[PDB]
Design a protein around this motif. Structure first.
Motif, PDB file in Angstrom:
ATOM      1  N   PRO A 142       4.524   0.628   3.901  1.00  0.00           N
ATOM      2  CA  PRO A 142       3.976   1.033   2.614  1.00  0.00           C
ATOM      3  C   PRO A 142       3.650   2.523   2.500  1.00  0.00           C
ATOM      4  CG  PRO A 142       2.282  -0.004   3.899  1.00  0.00           C
ATOM      5  CD  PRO A 142       3.558  -0.167   4.663  1.00  0.00           C
ATOM      6  N   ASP A 143       3.718   3.006   1.269  1.00  0.00           N
ATOM      7  CA  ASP A 143       3.179   4.325   0.929  1.00  0.00           C
ATOM      8  C   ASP A 143       2.470   4.163  -0.386  1.00  0.00           C
ATOM      9  OD1 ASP A 143       5.169   4.413  -1.103  1.00  0.00           O
ATOM     10  OD2 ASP A 143       6.524   5.426   0.262  1.00  0.00           O
ATOM     11  N   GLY A 144       1.839   5.217  -0.865  1.00  0.00           N
ATOM     12  CA  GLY A 144       1.077   5.068  -2.114  1.00  0.00           C
ATOM     13  C   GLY A 144       1.885   4.575  -3.302  1.00  0.00           C
ATOM     14  N   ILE A 145       3.113   5.075  -3.417  1.00  0.00           N
ATOM     15  CA  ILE A 145       3.963   4.644  -4.510  1.00  0.00           C
ATOM     16  C   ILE A 145       4.195   3.128  -4.402  1.00  0.00           C
ATOM     17  CG2 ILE A 145       6.326   4.792  -5.487  1.00  0.00           C
ATOM     18  CD1 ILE A 145       6.116   7.892  -4.843  1.00  0.00           C
ATOM     19  N   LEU A 146       4.506   2.627  -3.204  1.00  0.00           N
ATOM     20  CA  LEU A 146       4.793   1.212  -3.088  1.00  0.00           C
ATOM     21  C   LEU A 146       3.582   0.352  -3.418  1.00  0.00           C
ATOM     22  CD1 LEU A 146       7.025  -0.802  -2.209  1.00  0.00           C
ATOM     23  CD2 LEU A 146       5.903  -0.857   0.083  1.00  0.00           C
ATOM     24  N   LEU A 147       2.423   0.715  -2.907  1.00  0.00           N
ATOM     25  CA  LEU A 147       1.233  -0.074  -3.152  1.00  0.00           C
ATOM     26  C   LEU A 147       0.903  -0.116  -4.655  1.00  0.00           C
ATOM     27  CD1 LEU A 147      -0.756   1.170  -0.081  1.00  0.00           C
ATOM     28  CD2 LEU A 147       0.127  -1.146  -0.418  1.00  0.00           C
ATOM     29  N   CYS A 148       1.080   0.996  -5.344  1.00  0.00           N
ATOM     30  CA  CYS A 148       0.894   1.056  -6.822  1.00  0.00           C
ATOM     31  C   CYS A 148       1.861   0.146  -7.524  1.00  0.00           C
ATOM     32  CB  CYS A 148       1.122   2.452  -7.387  1.00  0.00           C
ATOM     33  SG  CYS A 148      -0.282   3.584  -7.033  1.00  0.00           S
ATOM     34  N   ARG A 149       3.103   0.246  -7.098  1.00  0.00           N
ATOM     35  CA  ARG A 149       4.207  -0.462  -7.773  1.00  0.00           C
ATOM     36  C   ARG A 149       4.084  -1.959  -7.596  1.00  0.00           C
ATOM     37  NH1 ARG A 149       8.647   2.741  -7.683  1.00  0.00           N
ATOM     38  NH2 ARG A 149       8.408   2.791 -10.000  1.00  0.00           N
ATOM     39  N   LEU A 150       3.755  -2.395  -6.390  1.00  0.00           N
ATOM     40  CA  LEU A 150       3.500  -3.820  -6.162  1.00  0.00           C
ATOM     41  C   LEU A 150       2.432  -4.385  -7.070  1.00  0.00           C
ATOM     42  CD1 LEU A 150       3.795  -3.797  -2.267  1.00  0.00           C
ATOM     43  CD2 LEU A 150       5.329  -5.107  -3.824  1.00  0.00           C
ATOM     44  N   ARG A 151       1.388  -3.609  -7.353  1.00  0.00           N
ATOM     45  CA  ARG A 151       0.283  -4.053  -8.170  1.00  0.00           C
ATOM     46  C   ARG A 151       0.756  -4.262  -9.605  1.00  0.00           C
ATOM     47  NH1 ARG A 151      -4.800  -0.296  -7.771  1.00  0.00           N
ATOM     48  NH2 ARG A 151      -3.271   1.093  -8.758  1.00  0.00           N
ATOM     49  N   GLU A 152       1.531  -3.313 -10.096  1.00  0.00           N
ATOM     50  CA  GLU A 152       2.054  -3.365 -11.446  1.00  0.00           C
ATOM     51  C   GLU A 152       3.026  -4.512 -11.612  1.00  0.00           C
ATOM     52  OE1 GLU A 152       0.869  -1.489 -13.828  1.00  0.00           O
ATOM     53  OE2 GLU A 152      -0.104   0.064 -12.604  1.00  0.00           O
ATOM     54  N   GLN A 153       3.795  -4.770 -10.574  1.00  0.00           N
ATOM     55  CA  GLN A 153       4.799  -5.839 -10.653  1.00  0.00           C
ATOM     56  C   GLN A 153       4.174  -7.193 -10.707  1.00  0.00           C
ATOM     57  OE1 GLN A 153       7.441  -4.721  -7.369  1.00  0.00           O
ATOM     58  NE2 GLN A 153       8.862  -3.730  -8.816  1.00  0.00           N
ATOM     59  N   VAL A 154       3.146  -7.429  -9.902  1.00  0.00           N
ATOM     60  CA  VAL A 154       2.499  -8.715  -9.959  1.00  0.00           C
ATOM     61  C   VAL A 154       1.958  -8.988 -11.365  1.00  0.00           C
ATOM     62  CG1 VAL A 154       0.733 -10.150  -8.998  1.00  0.00           C
ATOM     63  CG2 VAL A 154       2.001  -8.697  -7.511  1.00  0.00           C
ATOM     64  N   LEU A 155       1.265  -7.993 -11.921  1.00  0.00           N
ATOM     65  CA  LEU A 155       0.684  -8.114 -13.245  1.00  0.00           C
ATOM     66  C   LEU A 155       1.767  -8.376 -14.308  1.00  0.00           C
ATOM     67  CD1 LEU A 155      -2.016  -5.322 -12.918  1.00  0.00           C
ATOM     68  CD2 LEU A 155      -2.531  -7.679 -13.525  1.00  0.00           C
ATOM     69  N   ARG A 156       2.832  -7.597 -14.273  1.00  0.00           N
ATOM     70  CA  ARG A 156       3.824  -7.690 -15.290  1.00  0.00           C
ATOM     71  C   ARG A 156       4.599  -8.998 -15.176  1.00  0.00           C
ATOM     72  NH1 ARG A 156       5.712  -1.425 -14.250  1.00  0.00           N
ATOM     73  NH2 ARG A 156       3.824  -0.572 -15.231  1.00  0.00           N
ATOM     74  N   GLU A 157       4.896  -9.426 -13.947  1.00  0.00           N
ATOM     75  CA  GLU A 157       5.574 -10.713 -13.789  1.00  0.00           C
ATOM     76  C   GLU A 157       4.806 -11.849 -14.445  1.00  0.00           C
ATOM     77  OE1 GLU A 157       6.572 -11.424  -9.720  1.00  0.00           O
ATOM     78  OE2 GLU A 157       7.786  -9.565  -9.692  1.00  0.00           O
ATOM     79  N   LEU A 158       3.474 -11.805 -14.357  1.00  0.00           N
ATOM     80  CA  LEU A 158       2.602 -12.800 -14.973  1.00  0.00           C
ATOM     81  C   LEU A 158       2.430 -12.643 -16.484  1.00  0.00           C
ATOM     82  CD1 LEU A 158      -0.005 -12.722 -12.175  1.00  0.00           C
ATOM     83  CD2 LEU A 158       1.454 -14.715 -12.720  1.00  0.00           C
ATOM     84  N   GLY A 159       3.085 -11.645 -17.044  1.00  0.00           N
ATOM     85  CA  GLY A 159       3.172 -11.477 -18.504  1.00  0.00           C
ATOM     86  C   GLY A 159       2.103 -10.558 -19.070  1.00  0.00           C
ATOM     87  N   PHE A 160       1.270  -9.966 -18.202  1.00  0.00           N
ATOM     88  CA  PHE A 160       0.359  -8.904 -18.687  1.00  0.00           C
ATOM     89  C   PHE A 160       1.164  -7.660 -19.022  1.00  0.00           C
ATOM     90  CE2 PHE A 160      -2.483 -11.346 -15.972  1.00  0.00           C
ATOM     91  CZ  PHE A 160      -3.443 -11.663 -16.901  1.00  0.00           C
ATOM     92  N   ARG A 161       0.812  -6.981 -20.110  1.00  0.00           N
ATOM     93  CA  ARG A 161       1.542  -5.781 -20.489  1.00  0.00           C
ATOM     94  C   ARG A 161       0.673  -4.521 -20.610  1.00  0.00           C
ATOM     95  NH1 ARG A 161       4.958  -8.242 -18.677  1.00  0.00           N
ATOM     96  NH2 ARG A 161       7.032  -8.763 -19.521  1.00  0.00           N
ATOM     97  N   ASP A 162      -0.586  -4.698 -20.957  1.00  0.00           N
ATOM     98  CA  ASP A 162      -1.505  -3.556 -20.989  1.00  0.00           C
ATOM     99  C   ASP A 162      -2.916  -4.074 -20.974  1.00  0.00           C
ATOM    100  OD1 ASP A 162      -2.870  -1.242 -21.254  1.00  0.00           O
ATOM    101  OD2 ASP A 162      -1.781  -0.508 -23.016  1.00  0.00           O
ATOM    102  N   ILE A 163      -3.394  -4.423 -19.788  1.00  0.00           N
ATOM    103  CA  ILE A 163      -4.703  -5.011 -19.709  1.00  0.00           C
ATOM    104  C   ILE A 163      -5.791  -4.020 -20.119  1.00  0.00           C
ATOM    105  CG2 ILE A 163      -3.998  -6.720 -17.995  1.00  0.00           C
ATOM    106  CD1 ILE A 163      -5.308  -5.188 -15.895  1.00  0.00           C
ATOM    107  N   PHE A 164      -5.466  -2.729 -20.164  1.00  0.00           N
ATOM    108  CA  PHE A 164      -6.443  -1.701 -20.517  1.00  0.00           C
ATOM    109  C   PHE A 164      -6.379  -1.273 -21.973  1.00  0.00           C
ATOM    110  CE2 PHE A 164      -8.479  -0.591 -16.549  1.00  0.00           C
ATOM    111  CZ  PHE A 164      -7.635  -1.194 -15.629  1.00  0.00           C
ATOM    112  N   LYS A 165      -5.640  -2.019 -22.784  1.00  0.00           N
ATOM    113  CA  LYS A 165      -5.301  -1.504 -24.120  1.00  0.00           C
ATOM    114  C   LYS A 165      -6.550  -1.384 -24.983  1.00  0.00           C
ATOM    115  CE  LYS A 165      -2.828  -0.428 -27.801  1.00  0.00           C
ATOM    116  NZ  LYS A 165      -2.700   1.002 -28.090  1.00  0.00           N
ATOM    117  N   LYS A 166      -7.419  -2.385 -24.941  1.00  0.00           N
ATOM    118  CA  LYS A 166      -8.611  -2.333 -25.796  1.00  0.00           C
ATOM    119  C   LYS A 166      -9.494  -1.128 -25.414  1.00  0.00           C
ATOM    120  CE  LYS A 166     -12.750  -4.796 -27.383  1.00  0.00           C
ATOM    121  NZ  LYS A 166     -13.336  -6.054 -27.967  1.00  0.00           N
TER     122      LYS A 166
END
Ligand SMILES: [Mg+2]
Ligand SMILES: [Mg+2]
Length: 343
Positions: free
Chosen positions: A93-117
């Motif tokens: 792992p490197d920082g890019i990978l750890l970031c990217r894995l986090r985003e992928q899990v969220l997006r796969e589950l259908g979240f698109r912008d949990i911070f939008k509000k």
């Protein structure tokens, strides 16, 4: 699809490396996670509660709470996998990978912008203060002191009792990396005509830190390109959202300053850090004649790109918000990095 940012000297191969902090060397045991890897994996694991809480209250997603539990489980598991086998999940792992894995899990589950509000709320509050904050900098007579005030505003925005209070409560100088005297010296010649700025957070950051600074550049005769994420990541501002904000703040002027030389660019990025070897053609086109590249925030400017060499002048500016990053730099939590490289 993507191309190298044009201000990276070619060949970028074996010269540009996005990630600043190494976790592993080639001679380390490849089957055992290293201390830095474990440390940084733990940083990301420790983000899970905040991301889970934000996810679970994303009412736009049907049955958010169950999905958020699955996120916390799946991402925690990927991280424990990496501690047991650094070669798993596309590691080591490197920082890019750890970031990217986090985003992928969220997006796969259908979240698109949990911070939008929260993004929308913070933008709205900041937009109300833009004229006031801009008035305070415009009132400063000396151009160099004005710059300093705008630089303090960038740091304050990048953490934010009020934004203006935060401007006054930054850690005392010298900063951990403090090249502001050098930068101010060049700024007063008005020698830059083409700035490109990689922006970071929504709310006070983009509106009260970056945009007044951008406005000052415009006023001094520079063209300014604001490069923002294509896709949401944390509370970072996207190109689409920044276009909306500018429309909201604008005789098409920003408090009497013409914006014809202000361009908003999609960087193609979808993380809170950035690999400058892969940017959109849009950005590459708009940055082909840049003579100042400014990279804002800890993710894009410190965890990535801090030591990146550019063909033109470059500035990495951001607040240090991880103890592990402070440790690496030998600085304080909340230290300010203002790293300027001329020529
Ligand atoms: Mg951010
Ligand atoms: Mg990060």
């Amino acid at each position: 699809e993507m191309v190298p940012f044009p201000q990276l000297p070619m060949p970028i191969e074996n010269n540009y490396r996005a990630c600043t902090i190494p976790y592993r060397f080639p001679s380390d045991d490849p089957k055992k996670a290293t201390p830095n890897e474990i440390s940084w994996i733990n940083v990301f694991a420790n983000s899970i509660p905040s991301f889970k809480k934000r996810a679970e209250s994303d009412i736009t997603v049907p049955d958010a709470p169950a999905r958020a539990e699955k996120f916390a489980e799946r991402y925690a598991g990927i991280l424990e996998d990496l501690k047991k086998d650094p070669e798993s999940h596309g590691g080591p792992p490197d920082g890019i990978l750890l970031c990217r894995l986090r985003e992928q899990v969220l997006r796969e589950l259908g979240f698109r912008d949990i911070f939008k509000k929260v993004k929308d709320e913070e933008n709205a509050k900041a937009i109300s203060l833009f004229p006031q904050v801009v008035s305070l900098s415009d009132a400063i007579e000396d151009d160099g002191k004005r710059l300093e005030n705008l630089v303090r505003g960038i740091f304050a925005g990048n953490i934010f009792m009020s934004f203006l209070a935060s401007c006054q409560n930054l850690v005392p100088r010298p900063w951990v990396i403090d090249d502001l005297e050098n930068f101010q010296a060049k700024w007063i010649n008005k020698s830059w005509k083409k700035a490109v700025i990689f922006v970071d957070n929504s709310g006070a950051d983009i509106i009260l830190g970056i945009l007044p600074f951008a406005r000052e550049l415009l006023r001094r005769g520079a063209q300014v390109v604001l490069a923002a994420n294509e896709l949401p990541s944390i509370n970072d501002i996207t190109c689409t959202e920044l276009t909306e904000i500018l429309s909201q703040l604008k005789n098409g002027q920003l408090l009497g300053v013409d914006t014809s030389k202000l361009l908003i660019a999609n960087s193609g990025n979808d993380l809170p850090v950035i690999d400058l070897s892969r940017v959109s053609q849009e950005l590459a086109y708009l940055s082909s004649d840049a003579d100042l590249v400014i990279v804002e925030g800890m993710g894009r400017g410190i965890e990535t790109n801090l030591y990146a060499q550019f063909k033109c002048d470059s500035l990495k500016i951001g607040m240090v918000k991880h103890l592990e990053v402070a440790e690496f730099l030998g600085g304080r939590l909340y230290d300010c990095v203002f790293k300027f490289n001329e020529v």
